[PDB]
mmCIF file of C-alpha atoms and ligand atoms in Angstrom:
data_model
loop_
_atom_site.group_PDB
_atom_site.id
_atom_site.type_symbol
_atom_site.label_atom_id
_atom_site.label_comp_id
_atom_site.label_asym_id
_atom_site.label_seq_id
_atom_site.Cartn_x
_atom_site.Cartn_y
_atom_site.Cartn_z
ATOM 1 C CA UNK N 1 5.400 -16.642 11.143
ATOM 2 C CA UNK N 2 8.082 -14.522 12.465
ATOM 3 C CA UNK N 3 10.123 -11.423 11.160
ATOM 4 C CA UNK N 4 13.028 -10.874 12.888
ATOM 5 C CA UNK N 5 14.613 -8.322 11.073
ATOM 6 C CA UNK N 6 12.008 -5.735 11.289
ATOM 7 C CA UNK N 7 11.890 -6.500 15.047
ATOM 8 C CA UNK N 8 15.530 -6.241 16.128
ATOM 9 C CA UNK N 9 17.937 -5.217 12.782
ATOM 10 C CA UNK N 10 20.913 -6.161 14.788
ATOM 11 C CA UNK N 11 20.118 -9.498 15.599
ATOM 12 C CA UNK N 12 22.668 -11.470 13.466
ATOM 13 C CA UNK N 13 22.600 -14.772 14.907
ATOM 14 C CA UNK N 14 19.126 -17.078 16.068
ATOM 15 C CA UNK N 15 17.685 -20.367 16.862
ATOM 16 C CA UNK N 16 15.291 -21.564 13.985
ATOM 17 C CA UNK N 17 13.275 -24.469 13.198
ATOM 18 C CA UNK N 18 12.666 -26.300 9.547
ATOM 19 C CA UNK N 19 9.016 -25.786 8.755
ATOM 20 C CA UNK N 20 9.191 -26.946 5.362
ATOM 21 C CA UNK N 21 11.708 -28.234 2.671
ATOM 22 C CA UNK N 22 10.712 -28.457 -1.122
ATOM 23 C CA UNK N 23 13.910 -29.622 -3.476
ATOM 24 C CA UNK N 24 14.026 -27.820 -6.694
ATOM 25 C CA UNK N 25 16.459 -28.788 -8.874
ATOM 26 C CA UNK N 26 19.258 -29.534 -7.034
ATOM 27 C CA UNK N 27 18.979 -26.809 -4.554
ATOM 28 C CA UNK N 28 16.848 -26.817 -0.771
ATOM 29 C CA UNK N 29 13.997 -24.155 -0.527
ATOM 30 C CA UNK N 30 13.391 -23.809 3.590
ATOM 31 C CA UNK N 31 10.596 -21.997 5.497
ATOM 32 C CA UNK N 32 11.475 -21.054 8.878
ATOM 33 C CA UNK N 33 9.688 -20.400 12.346
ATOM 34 C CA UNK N 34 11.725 -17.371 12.719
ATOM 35 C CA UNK N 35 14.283 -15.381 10.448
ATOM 36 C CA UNK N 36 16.973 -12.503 10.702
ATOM 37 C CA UNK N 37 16.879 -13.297 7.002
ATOM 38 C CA UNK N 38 16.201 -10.056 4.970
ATOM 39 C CA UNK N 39 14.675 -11.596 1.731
ATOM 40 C CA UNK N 40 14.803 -7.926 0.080
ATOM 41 C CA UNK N 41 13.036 -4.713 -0.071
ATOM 42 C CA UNK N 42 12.951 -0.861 -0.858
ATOM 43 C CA UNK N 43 15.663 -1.982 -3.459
ATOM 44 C CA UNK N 44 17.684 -3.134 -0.811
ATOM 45 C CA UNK N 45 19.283 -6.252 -1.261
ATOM 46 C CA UNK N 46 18.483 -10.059 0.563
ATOM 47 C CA UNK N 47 20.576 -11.521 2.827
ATOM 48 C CA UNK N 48 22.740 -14.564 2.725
ATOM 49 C CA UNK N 49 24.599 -16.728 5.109
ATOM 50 C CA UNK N 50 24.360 -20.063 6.747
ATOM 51 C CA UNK N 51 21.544 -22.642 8.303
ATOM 52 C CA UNK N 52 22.524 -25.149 10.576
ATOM 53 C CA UNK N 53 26.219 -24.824 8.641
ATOM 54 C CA UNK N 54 24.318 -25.138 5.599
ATOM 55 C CA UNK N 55 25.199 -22.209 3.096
ATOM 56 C CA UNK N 56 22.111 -20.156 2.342
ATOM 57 C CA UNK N 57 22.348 -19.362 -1.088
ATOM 58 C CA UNK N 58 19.134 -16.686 -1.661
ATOM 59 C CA UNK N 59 16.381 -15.480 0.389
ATOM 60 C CA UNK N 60 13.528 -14.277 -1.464
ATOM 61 C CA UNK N 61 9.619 -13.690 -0.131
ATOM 62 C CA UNK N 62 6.663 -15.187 -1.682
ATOM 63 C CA UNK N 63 2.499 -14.724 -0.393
ATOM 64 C CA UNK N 64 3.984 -13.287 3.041
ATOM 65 C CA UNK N 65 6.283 -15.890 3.517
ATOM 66 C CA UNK N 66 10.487 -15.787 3.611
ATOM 67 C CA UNK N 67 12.342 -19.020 2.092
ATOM 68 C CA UNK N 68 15.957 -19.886 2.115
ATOM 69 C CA UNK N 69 17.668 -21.659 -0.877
ATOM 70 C CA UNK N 70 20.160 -23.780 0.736
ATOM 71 C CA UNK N 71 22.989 -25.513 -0.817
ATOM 72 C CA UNK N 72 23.134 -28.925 0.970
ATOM 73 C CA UNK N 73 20.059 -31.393 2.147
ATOM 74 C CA UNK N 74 18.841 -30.080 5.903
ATOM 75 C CA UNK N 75 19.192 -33.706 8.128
ATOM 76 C CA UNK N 76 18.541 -32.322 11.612
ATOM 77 C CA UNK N 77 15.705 -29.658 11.694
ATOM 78 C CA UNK N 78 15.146 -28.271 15.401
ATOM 79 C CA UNK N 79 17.099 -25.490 17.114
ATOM 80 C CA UNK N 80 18.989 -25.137 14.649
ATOM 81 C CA UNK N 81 22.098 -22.574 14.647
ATOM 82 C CA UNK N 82 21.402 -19.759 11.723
ATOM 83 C CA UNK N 83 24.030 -16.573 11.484
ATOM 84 C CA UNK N 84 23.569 -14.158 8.800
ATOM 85 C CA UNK N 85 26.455 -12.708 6.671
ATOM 86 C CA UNK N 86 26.465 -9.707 8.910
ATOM 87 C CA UNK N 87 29.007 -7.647 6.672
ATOM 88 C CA UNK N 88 26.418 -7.824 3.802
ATOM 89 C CA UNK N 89 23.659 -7.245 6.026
ATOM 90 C CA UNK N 90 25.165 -3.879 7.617
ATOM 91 C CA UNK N 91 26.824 -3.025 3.893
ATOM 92 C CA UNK N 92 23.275 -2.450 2.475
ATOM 93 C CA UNK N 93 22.448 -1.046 5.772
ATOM 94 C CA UNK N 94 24.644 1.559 5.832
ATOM 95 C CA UNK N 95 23.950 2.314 2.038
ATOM 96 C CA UNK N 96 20.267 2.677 2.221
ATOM 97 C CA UNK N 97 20.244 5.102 5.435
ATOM 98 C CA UNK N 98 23.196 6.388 3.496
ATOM 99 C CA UNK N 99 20.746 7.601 0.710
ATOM 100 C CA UNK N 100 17.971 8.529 3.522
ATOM 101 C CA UNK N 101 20.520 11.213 4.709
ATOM 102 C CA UNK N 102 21.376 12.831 1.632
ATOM 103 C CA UNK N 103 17.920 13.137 0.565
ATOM 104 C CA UNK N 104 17.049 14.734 3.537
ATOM 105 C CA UNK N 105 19.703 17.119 3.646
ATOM 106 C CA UNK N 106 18.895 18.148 0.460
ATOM 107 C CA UNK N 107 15.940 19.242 1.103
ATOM 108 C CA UNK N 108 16.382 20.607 4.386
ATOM 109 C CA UNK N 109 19.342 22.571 3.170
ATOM 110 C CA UNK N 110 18.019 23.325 -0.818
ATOM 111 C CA UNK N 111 14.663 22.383 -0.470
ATOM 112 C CA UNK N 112 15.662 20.097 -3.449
ATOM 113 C CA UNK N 113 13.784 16.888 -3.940
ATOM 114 C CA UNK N 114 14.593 13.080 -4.705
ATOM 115 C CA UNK N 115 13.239 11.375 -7.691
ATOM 116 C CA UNK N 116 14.959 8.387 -7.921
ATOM 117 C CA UNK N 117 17.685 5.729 -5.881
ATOM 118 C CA UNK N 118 19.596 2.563 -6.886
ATOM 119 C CA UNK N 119 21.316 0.443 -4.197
ATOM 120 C CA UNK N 120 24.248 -1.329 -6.059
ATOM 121 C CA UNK N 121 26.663 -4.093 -5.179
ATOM 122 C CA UNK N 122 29.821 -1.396 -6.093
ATOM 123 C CA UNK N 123 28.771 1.529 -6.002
ATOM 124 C CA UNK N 124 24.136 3.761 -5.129
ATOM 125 C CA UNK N 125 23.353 6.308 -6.683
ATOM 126 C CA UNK N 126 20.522 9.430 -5.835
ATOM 127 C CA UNK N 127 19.060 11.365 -8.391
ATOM 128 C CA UNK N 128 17.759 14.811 -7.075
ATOM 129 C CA UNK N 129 15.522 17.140 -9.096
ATOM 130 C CA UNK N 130 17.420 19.478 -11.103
ATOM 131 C CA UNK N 131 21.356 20.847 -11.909
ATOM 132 C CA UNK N 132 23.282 21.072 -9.075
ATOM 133 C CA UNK N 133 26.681 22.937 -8.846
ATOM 134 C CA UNK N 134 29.391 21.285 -6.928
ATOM 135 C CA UNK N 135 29.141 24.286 -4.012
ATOM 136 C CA UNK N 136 25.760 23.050 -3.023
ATOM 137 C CA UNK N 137 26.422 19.084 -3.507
ATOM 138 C CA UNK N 138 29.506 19.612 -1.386
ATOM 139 C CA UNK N 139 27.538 21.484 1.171
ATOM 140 C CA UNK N 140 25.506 18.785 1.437
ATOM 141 C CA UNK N 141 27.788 16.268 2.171
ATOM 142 C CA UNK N 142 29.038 17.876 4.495
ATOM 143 C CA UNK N 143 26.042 18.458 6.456
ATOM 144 C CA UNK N 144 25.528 14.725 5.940
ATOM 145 C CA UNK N 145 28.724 13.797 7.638
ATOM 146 C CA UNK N 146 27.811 16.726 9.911
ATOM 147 C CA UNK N 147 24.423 15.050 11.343
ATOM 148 C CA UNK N 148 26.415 11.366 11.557
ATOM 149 C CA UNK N 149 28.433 13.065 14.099
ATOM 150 C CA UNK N 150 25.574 14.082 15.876
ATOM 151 C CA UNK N 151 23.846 11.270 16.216
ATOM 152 C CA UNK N 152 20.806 11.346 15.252
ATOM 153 C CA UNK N 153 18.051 8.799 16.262
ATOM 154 C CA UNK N 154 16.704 6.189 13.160
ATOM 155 C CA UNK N 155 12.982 4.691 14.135
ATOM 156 C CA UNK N 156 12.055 1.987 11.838
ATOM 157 C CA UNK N 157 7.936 1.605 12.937
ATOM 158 C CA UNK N 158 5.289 -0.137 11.151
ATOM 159 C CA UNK N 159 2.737 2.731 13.057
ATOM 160 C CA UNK N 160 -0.750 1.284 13.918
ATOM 161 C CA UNK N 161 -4.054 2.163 12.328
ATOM 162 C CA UNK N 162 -4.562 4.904 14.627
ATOM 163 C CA UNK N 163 -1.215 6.793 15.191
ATOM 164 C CA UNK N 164 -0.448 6.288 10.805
ATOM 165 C CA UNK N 165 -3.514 9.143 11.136
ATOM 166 C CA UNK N 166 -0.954 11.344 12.995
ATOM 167 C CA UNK N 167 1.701 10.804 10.305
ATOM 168 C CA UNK N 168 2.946 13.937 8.811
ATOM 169 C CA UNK N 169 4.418 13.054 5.504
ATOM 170 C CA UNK N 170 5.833 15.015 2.278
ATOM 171 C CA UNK N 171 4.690 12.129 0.057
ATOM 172 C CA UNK N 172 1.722 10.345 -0.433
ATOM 173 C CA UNK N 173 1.137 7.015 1.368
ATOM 174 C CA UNK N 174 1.048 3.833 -0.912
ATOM 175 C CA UNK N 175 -2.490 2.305 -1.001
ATOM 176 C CA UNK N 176 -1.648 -1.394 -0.346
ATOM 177 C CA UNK N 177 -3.043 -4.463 1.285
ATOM 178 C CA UNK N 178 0.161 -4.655 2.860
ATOM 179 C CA UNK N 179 1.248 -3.054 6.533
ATOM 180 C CA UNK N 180 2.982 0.461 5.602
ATOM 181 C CA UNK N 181 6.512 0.884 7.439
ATOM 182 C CA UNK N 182 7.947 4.068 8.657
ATOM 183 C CA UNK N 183 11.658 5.277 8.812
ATOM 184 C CA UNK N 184 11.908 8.072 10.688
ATOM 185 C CA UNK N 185 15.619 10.249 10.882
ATOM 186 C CA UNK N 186 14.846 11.860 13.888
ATOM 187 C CA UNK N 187 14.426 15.611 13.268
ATOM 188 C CA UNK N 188 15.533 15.464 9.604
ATOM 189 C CA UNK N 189 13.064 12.990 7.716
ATOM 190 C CA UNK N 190 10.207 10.614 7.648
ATOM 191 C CA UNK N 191 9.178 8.521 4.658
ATOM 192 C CA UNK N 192 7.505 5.187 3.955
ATOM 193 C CA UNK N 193 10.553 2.447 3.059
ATOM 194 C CA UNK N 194 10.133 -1.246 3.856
ATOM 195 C CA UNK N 195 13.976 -1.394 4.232
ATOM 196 C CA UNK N 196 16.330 -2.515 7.270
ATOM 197 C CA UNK N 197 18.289 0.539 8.493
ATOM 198 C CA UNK N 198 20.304 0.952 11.270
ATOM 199 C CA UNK N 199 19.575 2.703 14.249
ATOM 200 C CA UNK N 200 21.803 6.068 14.607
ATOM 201 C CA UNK N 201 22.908 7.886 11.918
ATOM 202 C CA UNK N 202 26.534 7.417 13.941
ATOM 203 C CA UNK N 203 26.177 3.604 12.247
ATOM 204 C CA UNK N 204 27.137 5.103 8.902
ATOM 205 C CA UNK N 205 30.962 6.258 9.722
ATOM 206 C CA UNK N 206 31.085 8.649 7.150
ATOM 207 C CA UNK N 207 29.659 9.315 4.068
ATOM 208 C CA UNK N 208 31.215 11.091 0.657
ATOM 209 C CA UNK N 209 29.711 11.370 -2.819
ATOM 210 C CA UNK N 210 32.325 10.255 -5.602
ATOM 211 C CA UNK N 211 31.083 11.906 -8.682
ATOM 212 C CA UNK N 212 27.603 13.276 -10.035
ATOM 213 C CA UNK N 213 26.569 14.226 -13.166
ATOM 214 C CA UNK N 214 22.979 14.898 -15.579
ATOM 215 C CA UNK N 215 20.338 12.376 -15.892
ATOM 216 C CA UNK N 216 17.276 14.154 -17.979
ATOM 217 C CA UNK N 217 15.758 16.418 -15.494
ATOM 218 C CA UNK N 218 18.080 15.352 -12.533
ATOM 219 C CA UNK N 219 21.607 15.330 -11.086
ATOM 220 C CA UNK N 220 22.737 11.700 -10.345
ATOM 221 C CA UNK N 221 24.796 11.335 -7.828
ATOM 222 C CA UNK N 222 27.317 8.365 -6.775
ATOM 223 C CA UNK N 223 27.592 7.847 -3.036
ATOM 224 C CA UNK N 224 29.911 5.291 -0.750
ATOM 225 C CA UNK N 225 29.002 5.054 3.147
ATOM 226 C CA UNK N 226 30.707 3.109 6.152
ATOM 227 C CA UNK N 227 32.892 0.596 5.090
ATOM 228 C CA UNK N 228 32.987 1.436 1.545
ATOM 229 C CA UNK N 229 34.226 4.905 2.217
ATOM 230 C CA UNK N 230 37.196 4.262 3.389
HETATM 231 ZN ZN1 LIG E 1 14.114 3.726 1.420
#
């Protein structure tokens, strides 16, 4: 069944149909035809919002398949009306490209590599290999902010069988069962991330790191983009 959110990330309203409904304990667990629903991924966050007016409460993926915990007892079940909470959607959005960019810049500026990311609810962090003065973090972000201005193209791609052989990566690929995605920051970066960006850098608004300090063998470093920002 269908994956909407890897197919167009902007969609943030559809037409869905009931495929199954299993009550557990006082809460509505619904399978879909379709979903815009991101049910998590890449340590981004799942989406939430509402089913035929119907609160959806948590998304969450399980053997391939995305199910909605809904609030209230589905009556009608056909073309139904779902919308996603699109300000949570393009929040982590933002966030996760957010960390994508500084990475990259990073190493295309320092040649200094990422070991580590969390995507919070108040505030992501990035935790790049080694100390880091504050001439070369701020140079950095400003390069960041820099390439949002340019615009830079974002291709999300799950590459077929044949063209992932023409993939030029820095890391090595995950062996999996699974289909690996590709996000792609046109000219900058290319890694494997099964998250939901968005599709210009431009999308971010700005970006600006709030404070960094050590963690063992790295510098972590707090970062705001787009909405949170400002
Ligand atoms: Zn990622």
């Amino acid at each position: 069944l269908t994956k909407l959110y890897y197919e167009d990330q902007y969609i943030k309203e559809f037409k869905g149909e009931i495929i199954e409904v299993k009550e557990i304990d006082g809460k509505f667990h619904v399978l879909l035809d379709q979903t815009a629903f991101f049910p998590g991924g890449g340590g981004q966050m799942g989406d939430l919002g509402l089913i035929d007016g119907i609160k959806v409460l948590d998304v969450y993926e399980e053997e391939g398949k995305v199910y909605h915990v809904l609030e209230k007892e589905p009556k009608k079940l056909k073309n139904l009306q779902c919308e996603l909470d699109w300000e949570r959607r393009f929040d982590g959005m933002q966030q996760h490209l957010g960390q994508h960019l500084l990475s990259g810049c990073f190493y295309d500026l320092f040649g200094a590599n990422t070991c580590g990311f969390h995507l919070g609810k108040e505030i992501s962090t990035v935790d790049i290999v080694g100390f880091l003065d504050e001439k070369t973090i701020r140079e950095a972000e400003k390069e960041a902010n820099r390439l949002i201005f340019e615009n830079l193209e974002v291709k999300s791609y799950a590459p077929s069988k044949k063209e992932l052989k023409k993939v030029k990566t820095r890391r090595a690929l995950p062996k999996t069962d699974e289909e690996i995605r590709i996000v792609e920051i046109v000219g900058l970066d290319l890694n494997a991330c099964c998250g939901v960006h968005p599709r210009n850098t431009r999308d971010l608004q700005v970006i600006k790191i709030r404070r960094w300090e050590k963690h063992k063998n790295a510098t972590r470093i707090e970062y705001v983009a787009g909405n949170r920002a400002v």
